Specification:
The complex is a heterotetramer, with two copies of chain A (146 residues) and two copies of chain C (141 residues).
Chain A lengths: L4 H12 L3 H15 L16 H5 L2 H18 L5 H4 L1 H10 L5 H17 L6 H19 L4
Helix pairs in contact in A: 1-8, 2-4, 2-7, 7-8
Chain C lengths: L3 H12 L5 H15 L17 H19 L4 H4 L1 H10 L4 H18 L6 H18 L5
Helix pairs in contact in C: 1-7, 2-3, 2-6, 6-7
The chains are: A mainly alpha (146), C mainly alpha (141).
The complex binds protoporphyrin IX containing FE (4 copies).
Amino acid sequence: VHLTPEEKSAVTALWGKVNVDEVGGEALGRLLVVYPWTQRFFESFGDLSTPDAVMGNPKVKAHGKKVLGAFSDGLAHLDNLKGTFATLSELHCDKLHVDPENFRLLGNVLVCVLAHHFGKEFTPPVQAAYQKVVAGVANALAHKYH
Amino acid sequence: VHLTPEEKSAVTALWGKVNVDEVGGEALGRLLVVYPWTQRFFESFGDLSTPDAVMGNPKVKAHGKKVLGAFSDGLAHLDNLKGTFATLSELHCDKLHVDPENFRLLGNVLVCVLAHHFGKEFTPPVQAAYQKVVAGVANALAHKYH
Amino acid sequence: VLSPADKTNVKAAWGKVGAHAGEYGAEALERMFLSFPTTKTYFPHFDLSHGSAQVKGHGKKVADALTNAVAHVDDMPNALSALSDLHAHKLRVDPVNFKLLSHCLLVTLAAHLPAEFTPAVHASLDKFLASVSTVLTSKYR
Amino acid sequence: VLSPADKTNVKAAWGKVGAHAGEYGAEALERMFLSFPTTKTYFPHFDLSHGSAQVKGHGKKVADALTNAVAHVDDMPNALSALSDLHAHKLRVDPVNFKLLSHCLLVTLAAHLPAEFTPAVHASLDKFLASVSTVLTSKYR
Ligand code: HEM
Ligand code: HEM
Ligand code: HEM
Ligand code: HEM
């Protein structure tokens, strides 16, 4: 959607070294802890009282694995990003009724998590790149509405 | 963009009884008073210290007359709304560098002004209609970016 | 923050409401459900027609609350702390909605009190409703 | 609001920074200008290259400020009221920007203190930086 050669590759560069069974769950988890009102959407998952309860929830990390799947996916289809999420758009839009601002939120915490594991490999030029991806991914899901 | 028959006409219905040399200036004025940070963009207009200074500024109300012109305009081209503002988009986007959230703001205060003069003629069904227009008008200007 | 003038203007205009407060309350509610449909999700069991007494009745419930908050202005985190738990911890309402109810609450006051709705007043009620929202979402920040 | 634990966690982690505070400050600044380019409009005269001493230097200016606010936590509207006038009334900065600097400030603290950045801490620094922003935009509400 704008990624220039290096960015294009740089983004994909890290993504390979990404422990798929960790990051997904950790991102979905922190979101529920830092922004409490998003818990309203996941009653069925059970106990989300203490931050540990959240982080130690099988369903939470099991579902989180599905969210990164969506990024890995759209990350491979930057051209038609505004159409890869067409269904998840309709879903989160008129099925679950989630305010779009919330998409922005999850986008940023993912950044926090990536920067968490890749310590010093996560440079400003990298963050800047990933910020664009994250932005398109969110912009896509809200497309159903507008 | 969604206006159903009655809405379509209802919107245009009021718009005719709209004193063009008042509303434009009154809406551009209130915006500067209620949301102070928007003054940063209009240094050249002069004194905008007191709410009276704002409301009593020839340039303010003279420019405000141009803003309603843009609405009257796009109000007549609901089909291709996302193309009528193409230039104003490029302008406010990479020329003036205005954050889009700010388009939403001016949209709402216009509503307050219309409801102010049409007192009881401004019914909920009407407000609901105008809210959609305003939304598209804003969504259009930000299109340049995304 | 609410400087002195602010809380001063607020009183006068909200004073000018009086018995209408209940009516204006329901009007506000109605305007919201209609303009921003997404908000109806929080009131499933409700009858949302035009006359609806639930709305007419819940319209007064909210009105009274604002009145009380206008009263105990110099201390809202105490006067409203009962509603905070409800709206924040029990119901878990998306913060953004509070923004939409404030807008419609202003749209109504400027259709019935065009004599009072001046840039100076308009600016004060916004700051006021702004605070009241923060207070209600208190356990999110 | 900042419950007790909050202000407690904040201290520990911000304590774990120390001499790095200045460094982290500049890093945050750089990360912002790069990711959200629109923000560069407020620093025209500036040299924004990688080494830039203005940035390196302004990076400490901001760091110290946060430190001070960490200190006088139980009273920020007083300790920061000088900056409020500057950022709000003199410079008139768009509120949204403050959101962008907070995000980058967190991205940095989790790349240098992965041992400290836990969900519980992460959650506290957000509430904190949140307040500090409100304080700085004070004369807008
Ligand atoms: C870019 C961000 C997001 C992505 C990529 C994403 C992706 C997904 C995916 C793939 C599913 C599962 C769909 C399926 O298996 O058919 C899902 C379901 C769902 N998402 Fe997320 N989501 C996003 C943001 C959010 C946000 C912010 C919320 C709201 C707090 C949310 C709430 C939900 C809910 C409630 C479901 C249903 C879960 C269930 O009962 O299985 N999502 N999401
Ligand atoms: C839907 C909302 C808006 C519409 C329809 C609109 C329309 C216009 C129009 C028609 C012009 C004059 C262009 C010309 O004469 O060639 C203009 C200029 C401008 N607008 Fe607005 N505008 C909108 C929102 C805003 C907002 C929210 C800001 C930012 C606070 C803004 C800042 C400006 C500035 C600084 C100029 C340059 C004025 C000058 O020096 O002549 N506008 N706008
Ligand atoms: C101006 C801000 C608000 C005030 C002053 C306010 C006030 C009230 C009051 C007085 C009640 C309590 C009735 C009782 O004691 O049972 C109430 C209930 C409730 N409010 Fe609000 N409210 C506000 C904003 C909102 C918003 C933005 C929403 C979401 C769209 C909302 C959703 C509800 C719901 C669903 C209930 C429970 C209704 C029931 O089942 O009885 N409120 N509110
Ligand atoms: C974490 C929140 C922030 C804090 C703690 C903060 C702190 C500071 C400090 C300490 C100074 C004062 C230096 C002096 O005394 O001359 C300053 C100046 C300034 N800040 Fe910030 N700031 C914050 C957010 C922002 C944001 C979001 C922007 C806008 C992108 C911004 C733009 C500026 C500008 C342009 C100056 C003037 C620089 C000059 O010409 O000397 N600040 N800030």
